[PDB]
Write a protein that binds this ligand. Structure first.
Ligand SMILES: *[C@@H](CC(=O)OCC)[C@H](C[C@@H]1CCNC1=O)NC(=O)[C@H](Cc1ccccc1)NC(=O)[C@H](CCC(=O)OC(C)(C)C)NC(=O)OCc1ccccc1
Ligand SMILES: *[C@@H](CC(=O)OCC)[C@H](C[C@@H]1CCNC1=O)NC(=O)[C@H](Cc1ccccc1)NC(=O)[C@H](CCC(=O)OC(C)(C)C)NC(=O)OCc1ccccc1
Lengths: 306, 306
């Protein structure tokens, strides 16, 4: 029993972190096979940051403009190219610790583990959701750029995020491992702001299923709702519209608990309208939206505490 | 910026996890050098669980009664002994992945990272506090016994917890790596219950410092309090008494923010008495008690967002 925000074991990713220096800028890189991936903003200096032209900044560098350190060992750069907002630095050594991996672009609402890293050395791990507005609520200081986000399926690491920047609200933006940003953001110091966010409805519902599997039913009611009547209420409370796809995704959790999705929806409608009356759900006084249905299945018992 | 419950990178601990079988019971073991540590309740079968005599159960086993698997490789047991509620199985191979490590007995209120493990294979990592009543609010299923808790200082792993059992409230109990339980609990299936818990006052205060360092001051007030007047209020709200030692521990955070401890105490007194008025602190609608002062210093910038 219990329910915690649980990150993937980070060992396979720790063995891939390096430090990348260019001029007086140091940040983190990811070393797989004989390539090191890092944010391209490593090539900026102070002033470059406002209006940098990366093609023009890069063509001015050689291979030996880049210093790469793996632990206490210098990796020699024998090649470099730019791919979107990332650099791909070819090095002379293949990483002997390279796990099976994939690059994946996660979708809004999905979760992943972040390995916060400084000067190429891992310092902590925590679980994030990709918000609807394409930012994450991370925890990052200066020097954390190039820290990556990932999931693990079997023994395969699916990398999905590389950290690039912090926005004025203290939330975070970055790219997939193709260097394509999540959201409308750009790697330069303009006046960009996170758009308005929404509560992730599918996840709140998954988490209500988790509470049931774990033995708690207090928030349920005798009612049902239609997808549409639910969505009218959803909009009023800044929740994402529920779709039939979301209803189908919730199938297996519905089956394990015996609670029809739209019945769980009515329960949710009631919680939004009435509050929790000073009670908790899985120890929480608020409606948690950062566990997916897959997160609940991965953590909860396959047997309901009936 | 940001503030997350952050676990230590788990790689050094993942390389030490094995599976230990005895009869039809499988659980996790920790492999350092040529010793594997596991809960001694591995030697119980069904019925043994209520009134087991471990000395009598153990003397009936040989070395080859124990099956130990490291990944896909069988480690041969050449020795075994009991130490408190743990077994120490000597094996023929020294773990080539043994990190620098210590065994430490953590104190109530202190935190640590848990590597949840099943059948010797790590499945997730999350941060816990040791509650005042010597339990943790973990997330564990059947097969999770022998999963360990740890901190990392530099590159040294300080192991502090091994998981043994779940109590009726869904919270968890276990031992240090000497096999001595945290709390009055015993490794048999009696009618034991967690004692009443308390809120960890020192940590709540550390977390209020974290909120200030991160730029937020809304909860402060013009008042001060004495240690004693504070404690009268503390008792009324099920908070631990504040001690002078706690005040001294909070020194560096006090210094970084310019807020005297007892002034932060007055602010806390006010929050307990009045509530948060529908506002959040570091994104939380409740007073968080699972970050130590060391957790705040390890995660927050050394520069206050003034
Ligand atoms: C990692 C970079 C690194 O590790 O090595 C040194 C370059 C930084 C991590 C950030 C900083 C704190 N926490 C983090 O997550 N990333 C950056 O410093 C990037 C750098 C950069 C350089 C060139 C081109 C593009 C990006 N910059 C930012 O994150 C930047 C920080 C501004 C900020 O919000 O912090 C304070 C201290 C001023 C409050 N953010 C940014 O430009 O956002 C857009 C914006 C700027 C100004 C006004 C309004 C919006
Ligand atoms: C790990 C053991 C393992 O991995 O391999 C198989 C042995 C178990 C992890 C627990 C179970 C679910 N989550 C966890 O954290 N640990 C146990 O099963 C131990 C086993 C044991 C055997 C012999 C001697 C001592 C301990 N037992 C318990 O945790 C036990 C479980 C009872 C429980 O609360 O679960 C449900 C399903 C019945 C709700 N807890 C226990 O004995 O607590 C004291 C108590 C028992 C009965 C009534 C009141 C209090």
């Amino acid at each position: 029993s219990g329910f915690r925000k649980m990150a993937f074991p980070s060992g396979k990713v720790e063995g891939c972190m390096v430090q990348v220096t260019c001029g007086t800028t140091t940040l983190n890189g990811l070393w797989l096979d004989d390539t090191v991936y890092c944010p391209r903003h490593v090539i900026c200096t102070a002033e470059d940051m406002l209006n940098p032209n990366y093609e023009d900044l890069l063509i001015r560098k050689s291979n030996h403009s880049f210093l790469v350190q793996a632990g206490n060992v210098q990796l020699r750069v024998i090649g470099h190219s730019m791919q979107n907002c990332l650099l791909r630095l070819k090095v002379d050594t293949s990483n002997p610790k390279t796990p099976k991996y994939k690059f994946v672009r996660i979708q809004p609402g999905q979760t992943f583990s972040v390995l916060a890293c400084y000067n190429g050395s891992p310092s902590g791990v925590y679980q994030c959701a990709m918000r609807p507005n394409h930012t994450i609520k991370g925890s990052f200081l200066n020097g954390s750029c190039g820290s990556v986000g990932f999931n693990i399926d079997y023994d395969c690491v699916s990398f999905c995020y590389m950290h690039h920047m912090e926005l004025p609200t203290g939330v975070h933006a970055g790219t997939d491992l193709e260097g394509k940003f999540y959201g409308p953001f750009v790697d330069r110091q303009t006046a960009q702001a996170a758009g308005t966010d929404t509560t992730i409805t599918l996840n709140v519902l998954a988490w209500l299923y988790a509470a049931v599997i774990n033995g708690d039913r207090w928030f349920l009611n005798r009612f049902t709702t239609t997808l549409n009547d639910f969505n009218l209420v959803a909009m009023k409370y800044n929740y994402e519209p529920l779709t039939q796809d979301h209803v189908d995704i919730l199938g297996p959790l519905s089956a394990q608990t015996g609670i029809a999705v739209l019945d769980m929806c009515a329960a949710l409608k009631e919680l939004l309208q009435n509050g929790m009356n000073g009670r908790t759900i899985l120890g929480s006084t608020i409606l948690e939206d950062e566990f997916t249905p897959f997160d609940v299945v991965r953590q909860c018992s396959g047997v309901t505490f009936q």
